[PDB]
RNA sequence: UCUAAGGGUCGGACGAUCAACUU
RNA sequence: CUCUUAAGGUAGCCAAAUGCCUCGUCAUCUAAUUAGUGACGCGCAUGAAUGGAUUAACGAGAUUCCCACUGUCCCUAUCUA
RNA sequence: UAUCUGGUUGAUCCUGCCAGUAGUCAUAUGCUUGUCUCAAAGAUUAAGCCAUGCAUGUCUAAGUAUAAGCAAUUUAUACAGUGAAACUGCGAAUGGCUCAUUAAAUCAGUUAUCGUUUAUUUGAUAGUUCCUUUACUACAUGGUAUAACUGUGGUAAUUCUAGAGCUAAUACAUGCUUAAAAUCUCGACCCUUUGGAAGAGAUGUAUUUAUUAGAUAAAAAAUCAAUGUCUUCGGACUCUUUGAUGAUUCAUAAUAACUUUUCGAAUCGCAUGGCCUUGUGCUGGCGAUGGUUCAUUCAAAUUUCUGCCCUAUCAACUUUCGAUGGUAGGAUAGUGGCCUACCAUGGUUUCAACGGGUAACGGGGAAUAAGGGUUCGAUUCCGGAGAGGGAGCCUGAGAAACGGCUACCA
RNA sequence: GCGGUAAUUCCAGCUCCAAUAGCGUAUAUUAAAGUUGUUGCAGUUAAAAAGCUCGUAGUUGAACUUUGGGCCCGGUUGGCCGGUCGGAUUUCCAACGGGGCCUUUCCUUCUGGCUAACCUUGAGUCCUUGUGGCUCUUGGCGAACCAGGACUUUUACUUUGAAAAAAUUAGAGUGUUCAAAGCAGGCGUAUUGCUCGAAUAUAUUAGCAUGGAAUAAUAGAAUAGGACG
RNA sequence: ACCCACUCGGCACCUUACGAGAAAUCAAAGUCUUUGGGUUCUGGGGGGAGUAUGGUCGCAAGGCUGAAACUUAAAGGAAUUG
RNA sequence: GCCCGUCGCUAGUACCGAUUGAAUGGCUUAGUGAGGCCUCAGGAUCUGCAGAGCGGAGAAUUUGGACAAACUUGGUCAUUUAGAGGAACUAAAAGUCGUAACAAGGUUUCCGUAGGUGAACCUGCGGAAGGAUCAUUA
């Protein structure tokens, strides 16, 4: 969808335990915390130079990516900070010795360090259930057409 | 099921203990201890079924009540005690000394040793970790923990405990060309070198192995146990040297050896 | 809940029960070898069909296939140690040409009366 | 009794699952503690493993951190102003995490006037060597210095007193403070 | 006894101001 | 098979407001039913724009049953102008 | 071990079926029946009901002995053997039975817990506990309150129990001990410096909170805030600490606070020795049980991905009351709409959802045998669920227990 | 389909037949059944091509882009001798694949860590008139693989492997007396111990790691916003 | 325009049949047990029955979808002689 | 020869069918609401630090919330199930009516559609050949 204006919500969304002592003067306005998630996944600039919060982003957040890493195409970009990915695949029947087309949809969380849409073939990784369906978080994203 | 389990069924025990299907519903269900039960060995298994010294667990219990046994030089009286790899077992009423290790067929082996070499052992470092008060510590595969280690030690290496004082001494790192025992899978019991490590960040890095016969095979890393330098094990090895003959070589050796 | 006791049966019936030639030959061997009923014949044929199954299984494979080599040699030396087979037919093809009368000659019932001591299979 | 399970819940496809097993204690839930403000009333609780939880109910004397000064005091808890989840919590002056309040100022006052030797928005040559050394770090934000005149200071919670039994938090500073200040003049 | 939501007017993402009834 | 009509009542519908016999027969609703309904039909004397059959909806139209309600009643009493 | 045959016709060739055949670890039944070995067995219908009886209790040298028990036999006037009963501790949550439920529910295989608790085992681990710090505070050791027992008794009746009177603990509840060290605050004063300083106090662990470190990807300069060592008093600063993971706010340490303050041994059996300043002085072994935290084990819960039979005369479902998601909180051991406020309108589907049916627990596996398949799998192993049905619940590490309790129904 | 008076089928008797301590019956199921058909049915007339056409999903979907040549490497079978006291290796021989080079032919690249190998050579010698031969650091090899940055278009398929509970299945060895079975057991001095064992395979579909790069798809650079530098 | 010749695509025809088929017959009904170019639909003994019920569409007739119990050893196809 | 439908007797299968037909089980609204859990309270009874106060141990009872058994009524689906009367089918050996079809079956046959008729069926419109014509360039 978009990115908010950070403190749009009733509560001061911030990075916990990240203190920026106003007695100390500085050219930076906020101590930003971020990280690499590893597996060679490249942390984007936007995490580090941005002001968005998204605790559930693997960058600048408190989830920890580990487990499986999937890829898939994007089909729904509606909800706030979460999407749905379609995983197409095949299923082998020995009786006829053939395949057929099956698929499964994967609701995931997405960071507002990415900015995505339909298409946009995805890298996504397992992240310790988030809300009731969402077990996966975006890690990297591809372009579609150009 | 409302709690843990106090009873095991035969036909579920590890295949390498070599129990008959008959003679019971139930097997010892090894106690909690250093070693995980499927990777371990009970004392009753060691004595009754392998060394034949006793005939019933009744007698075996009587033996332990006599305190004839120690483990790592420590008297231990439990029937179901989970012994396992690199332990020490010694008996003084017969002055026999053993060391627990698998066959090339992955079965815990009758490997007798001297009174010395029941004076030391090995321990694979499963991890190092910074215990509180700033104090570091190390752990093993046999559940032991150690304070104040050699800083150069890191994970997956091995170490020479003394036995009884703890007291780590000279050790060996994980690095190429070293000598290794296998602790899992089809390759369990085998021996060979390190020839290459295959890294895979995310899980289950692999190690290629070459035996003395240039037979080559790969395993997971958690089933590794470095044991010394090539042509220089730090201990006394069992028969066969974890070298994995074929079935043809097996029967050939059997028929040729047997006779005269 | 103990270990189940393995078991099996040692024979198999025919598909076609009323066949003149089959009945006649079975009875011929019965009279020849001093037998009790068809179960024994069927049992020999059952073992034989097992063996020929194994034979086809091995011989499907390449020669030099270690499985076929090991198992064929072991099977062969078994069959010869029991003596059903001659000393020089020691190949996976001749075993297929093998038949039940070869098994039957190595019956104790036979070898006794063969080596005197009975004067009749029935006496034996 | 209560459950936290997701089997009572419908499915992703709006579907309705069956009663697969009866309720189990390892999925239990417990009813809350609408912690009010009063005498120290705390009921201890057996949790799983025999580990203990501590349900506060009526509190004063909260332990609050001052970040810039890096200290931590114990404060006569005053009252409640704002809560994002429900305004009822302010209406009842009921305490949770994220449960903004006012508190006494005098301990922080006397700490400041003790350490820096100064006053709050109005000899012993060793003590003088201390005060002069602490000088020029003895400045603060004007806005936070304001409430000192009033004697009642704004703070937030970091605890779950329905779990810990403790009511602990920290005085506001920075731009979070400015946010909730905009909220103060907006709501009150 | 309270809470929220629902307008106008004037000044440049807002600021000021006035009045309403309705859920 | 006959007499006989201009034609000989077809489609359809019923003891229906049209049927003597009649409280018609059968079933149902009832403890009990000349009631009502549904079926039957040689229908005294049904029947096709003298309109036949059905028909949602509407009816200060006629009728039966049910639920609730109640001095209609068992069974009367009391109070006010 | 790849096999067929009889029936339509007056006869012939096909299609197509009926019947015949063989097997069935798949049941019943009939007839018959000598032996050897081995051995399934109230699943099918009634997760229908049940008489009687049985199925979980437990002690070592080593927790509690005045049995007004026993034996007698021997150092013991505190006991010292054995040992009922009782207290205490542990277990009784395993095991065994059954398959009714359940249709991506379970279950199989494959992950993950940097998102969780963990009795027990094993290995590690605790010098700090009090007090304005000379007229102190049991440390050779501090306190009651109970059974068991005695006797008084009730009830038609149960493993019901009421009063009174004794008495222990590794029960219950209290409460001391201990080295120096440096580090921090506080400070009398003195003497002005470039400032030095007695002496007052704090500094185990746990809990909760805030903050900081937790480096490191390559090599050199200037400044300032402070504040450390060396001064060859102009000054330099040279050796200069850094853990692991693919990855963290991890490990851990530190500062300032917090706590109806967690722990830091008032316990038990064997032995019995050495040291004098001869007190019954001081030292002193073996092991048994406890205990904080960590690790390990035992597990446990959640959890990734793929996989379920029939049904379209089931095509839209989902959101009252979470239906999908977000933010915050609460609860959980813990993530999570798990629940609550508030907000958004999303979420699934002809690749078959939803609904229905299942005479459905899943699986490993069984039967049939050219092959590919089909059919089956209550059942000797794993996993799950249940204990007449529903719900709730105490204890404990662990149960929504049922050979445990409460309520409702039959 | 037998029976309506001389029943080859009924009732028995006689005789005879298959199996045999087992045999039959009923029901369910499997093969038979190529009568459910992926392998592997049929569709003019025997059942069955929609009245016809369009059409989304689905299924499928033309060809084409390094081929050829040359060099070396060293194997495992099969021969030709067999040296040898039935198994043995070198040459002679092919066959069969396998690996690495050159032919205009990434080897993902750095930043260093590491160098082993020499273009080295700084001194000459053991020793055949000397490049036969090796210790020996000072200019001068990357790959021999550590580890951080950057990507590599990605899938599908396939090979191999690991990881994969046991029991059951196949299956190895063994006189339970054979056999089902079991995992034993067998050898001396059987008065004073010796020892082998208790295999192996199958274990899929999903997931993981590797090799392969045909086949079938996908991407690129065309408003060059292209590339390398 | 008519004639010859040639080629595309049409309606069909004639002869043989290699081949196919149960046979009639067929240049497709062939290129099929030596069983695979792609793809949709339909059928599984006969009857009951295209009936019942449900749904839907239709003004209505009627259409589309589409059973069951029950019953039965034949029914049927091509072709030969009578 | 074969064969068709109505009618008729008998048996049976299922269908419609007034009867607000009956019955079992779920799921449920609404209502009622047990039970313990936590919670505001309470304070029989014991007690710390002449009596003082504060301060504990504390049962019965009690406020409130959640869980929620169970119950009432209605709805509701899923499965059985009664019913006058009606209307089909099937079957029977030795019934009534006729003779529609197979031959040019004696009106060639059949399909769809509409009407009518005791019955098979007749007729109308439009098709097919599965016909009783592979055929009239002469």
Would you kindly provide a written description of the structure presented here, covering whatever features stand out?
Chain D: The modification Phosphothreonine is found at residues 61, 106. Chain D: Residues 1-30 are annotated as: Disordered. Chain D: Belongs to the eukaryotic ribosomal protein eS8 family. This is part of a larger assembly, with chains A (146 residues), B (260 residues), C (124 residues) and D (188 residues). Chain A has 146 residues and is mainly beta. Chain A has one helix spanning 45-49, and strands spanning 69-76, 82-90, 101-109, 119-131, 134-141. In chain A, strands 3-2-1-4-5 form a five-stranded antiparallel beta sheet, with no helix packed on it. In chain A, a hairpin with a 5-residue loop joins strand 1 (69-76) and strand 2 (82-90). Chain A is elongated. Chain B has helices at 43-51, 57-65, 247-257, and strands at residues 8-9, 26-27, 69-70, 90-91, 96-98, 112-113, 123-124, 127-130, 136-139, 145-147, 158-160, 169-172, 178-182, 191-192, 196-198, 206-210, 216-220, 224-229, 232-233. The termini of chain B are far apart. Chain B has a four-stranded antiparallel beta sheet, with no helix packed on it. In chain B, strands 14-13-18-19 form a four-stranded antiparallel beta sheet, with no helix packed on it. Chain B has 260 residues and is of the alpha+beta class. In chain B, 11% of the residues lie in helices and 23% in strands. Chain B has three domains: 1-116, no CATH class; 121-171, no CATH class; 174-244, no CATH class. With 124 residues, chain C is an all-alpha fold. Chain C contains six helices and no strands. Chain C has helices spanning 20-33, 38-60, 66-82, 94-97, 100-105, 108-114. The longest helix of chain C is centred in the middle third of the chain and has 23 residues, at 38-60. With 188 residues, chain D is α+β, with helices and mostly antiparallel strands. Helices cover 28% and strands 22% of the residues of chain D. In chain D, a hairpin with a 4-residue loop joins strand 3 (62-66) and strand 4. Chain D starts with 40 loop residues before the first strand and ends with a helix. The A-D interface holds A 7, 9-12, 14, 19-23, 132-133 and D 6, 9, 12, 67-68, 84-85, 98, 137, 139-141, 173-174, 176, 179-180. The structure holds six RNA strands.
């Amino acid at each position: 969808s978009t990115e908010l204006t950070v403190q749009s919500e009733r509560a001061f969304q911030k990075q916990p335990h990240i203190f920026n002592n106003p007695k100390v003067k500085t050219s930076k306005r906020t101590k930003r915390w971020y990280k690499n998630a590893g597996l060679g996944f490249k942390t984007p600039k936007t995490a580090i130079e941005g002001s968005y919060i998204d605790k559930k982003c693997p960058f600048t957040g408190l989830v920890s990516i580990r487990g499986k890493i999937l890829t898939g195409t994007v089909v729904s970009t509606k909800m706030h900070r979460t999407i749905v990915i379609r995983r197409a695949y095949l299923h082998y029947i020995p009786k006829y010795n053939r395949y057929e087309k099956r698929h499964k949809n994967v609701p995931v969380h997405v960071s507002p360090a990415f900015r995505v849409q339909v298409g946009d073939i995805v890298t996504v990784g397992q992240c310790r259930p988030i809300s009731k369906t969402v077990r996966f978080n975006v890690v990297k994203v591809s372009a579609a057409a150009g | 099921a409302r709690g843990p389990k106090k009873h095991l069924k035969r036909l579920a025990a590890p295949h390498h203990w070599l129990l008959d299907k008959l003679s019971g519903c139930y097997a010892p269900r090894p106690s909690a201890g250093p070693h995980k039960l499927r990777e371990s060995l009970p004392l009753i298994v060691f004595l009754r079924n392998r060394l034949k010294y006793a005939l019933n667990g009744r007698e075996v219990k009587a033996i332990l009540m006599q305190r004839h046994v120690k483990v790592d030089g420590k008297v231990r009286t439990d029937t179901t005690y989970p012994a396992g790899f690199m332990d020490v077992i010694t008996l003084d009423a017969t002055n026999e000394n053993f060391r627990l290790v698998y066959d090339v067929k992955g079965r815990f082996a009758v490997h007798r040793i001297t009174d010395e070499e029941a004076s030391y052992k090995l321990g694979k470092v499963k991890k190092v970790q910074l215990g509180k008060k700033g104090v570091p510590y190390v752990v093993t595969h046999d559940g032991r923990t150690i304070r104040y280690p050699d800083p150069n030690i890191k994970v997956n290496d091995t170490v020479k405990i003394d036995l009884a004082s703890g007291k780590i001494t000279d050790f060996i790192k994980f690095d190429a060309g070293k000598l290794v025992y296998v602790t899992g899978g089809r390759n369990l019991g085998r021996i060979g070198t390190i020839v290459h490590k295959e890294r895979h960040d995310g899980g289950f890095d692999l190690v290629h192995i070459k035996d003395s016969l240039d037979n080559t095979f790969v395993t997971r890393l958690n089933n590794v146990f470095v044991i010394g330098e090539q042509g220089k094990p730090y201990i006394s090895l069992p028969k066969g040297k974890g070298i994995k003959l074929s079935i043809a070589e097996e029967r050939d050796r059997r028929r040729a050896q047997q006779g005269l | 809940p103990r270990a189940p006791r393995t078991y099996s049966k040692t024979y198999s019936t025919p598909k076609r029960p009323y066949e003149s030639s089959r009945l006649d030959a079975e009875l011929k061997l019965a009279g020849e070898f001093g037998l009790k009923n068809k179960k024994e014949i069927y049992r020999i044929s059952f073992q034989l069909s097992k063996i020929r199954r194994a034979a086809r299984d091995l011989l499907t494979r390449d020669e030099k296939d270690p499985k076929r080599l090991f198992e064929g040699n072991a099977l062969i030396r078994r069959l010869v140690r029991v003596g059903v087979l001659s000393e020089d037919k020691k190949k996976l093809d001749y075993v297929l040409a093998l038949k039940v009368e070869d098994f039957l000659e190595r019956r104790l019932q036979t070898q006794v009366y063969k080596l005197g001591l009975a004067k009749s299979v029935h006496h034996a | 009794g209560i459950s936290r399970d997701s089997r009572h819940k419908r499915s992703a496809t709006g579907a309705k699952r069956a009663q697969f097993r009866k309720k189990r204690k390892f999925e239990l839930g417990r009813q809350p503690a609408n912690t009010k403000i009063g005498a120290k009333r705390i009921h201890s609780v057996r949790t799983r493993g025999g580990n203990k939880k501590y349900r506060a109910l009526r509190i004063e004397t909260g332990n609050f951190s001052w970040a810039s000064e890096g200290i931590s005091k114990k404060t006569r808890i005053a009252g409640v102003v704002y809560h994002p989840s429900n305004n009822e919590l302010v209406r009842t002056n009921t305490l949770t995490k994220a449960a903004i309040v006012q508190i006494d100022a005098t301990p922080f006052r006397q700490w400041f006037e003790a350490h820096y030797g100064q006053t709050l928005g109005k000899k012993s040559k060793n003590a003088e060597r201390k005060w002069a050394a602490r000088a020029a770090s003895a400045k603060i934000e004007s806005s936070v210095e304001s409430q000192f005149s009033a004697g009642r200071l704004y703070a937030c919670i970091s605890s779950r007193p329905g779990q810990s039994g403790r009511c602990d938090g920290y005085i506001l500073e920075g731009e979070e403070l400015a946010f909730y200040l905009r909220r103060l003049t907006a709501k009150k």
